[PDB]
Design a binder for this molecule. Structure first.
Ligand SMILES: CCc1c(C(=O)Nc2cccc(S(=O)(=O)N(CC)CC)c2)[nH]c(C)c1C(C)=O
Length: 126
């Protein structure tokens, strides 16, 4: 079965607005979200629906853009690096579970390339 999705709010953490965090939502996340190959990454992998019984045996740190989007909207992240790390985990999971040349791997590669193009212009830390 599926685990609960990653937490998207933290009642026990203070919250702040920053140019970097707002950029990660409105520019980085928004641009990847609208890419033709974003769809397999817009929500947690549903291993029951997809019939992938070993997915959560292999992937113990799941992550997806739907979670990242909610985390940004909810001010879950204090440091911009926390968000960048979540994107990295999402891509790395894909490379762990799947094989070279799989459709999903090509889709991750396109997204990851776009991600690097967008974080290139991340505002400086304040
Ligand atoms: C290859 C399986 C996979 C997906 C994926 O999402 N594939 C998917 C395929 C068909 C339907 C649905 S779906 O029914 O859940 N669906 C309707 C279209 C989405 C709304 C999802 N994502 C990742 C990161 C992986 C892996 C294993 O790395």
């Amino acid at each position: 079965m599926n685990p609960p999705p990653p937490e998207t709010s933290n009642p026990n953490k203070p919250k702040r607005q920053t140019n970097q965090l707002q950029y990660l939502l409105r520019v980085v996340l928004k641009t990847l979200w609208k890419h033709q190959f974003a769809w397999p990454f817009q929500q947690p992998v549903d291993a029951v629906k997809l019939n992938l019984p070993d997915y959560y045996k292999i992937i113990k740190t799941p992550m997806d853009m739907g979670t990242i989007k909610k985390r940004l909207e909810n001010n879950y992240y204090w440091n911009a690096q926390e968000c960048i790390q979540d994107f990295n985990t999402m891509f790395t999971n894909c490379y762990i579970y799947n094989k070279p040349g799989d459709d999903i791997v090509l889709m991750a590669e396109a997204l990851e390339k776009l991600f690097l193009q967008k974080i290139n212009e991340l505002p400086t830390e304040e």
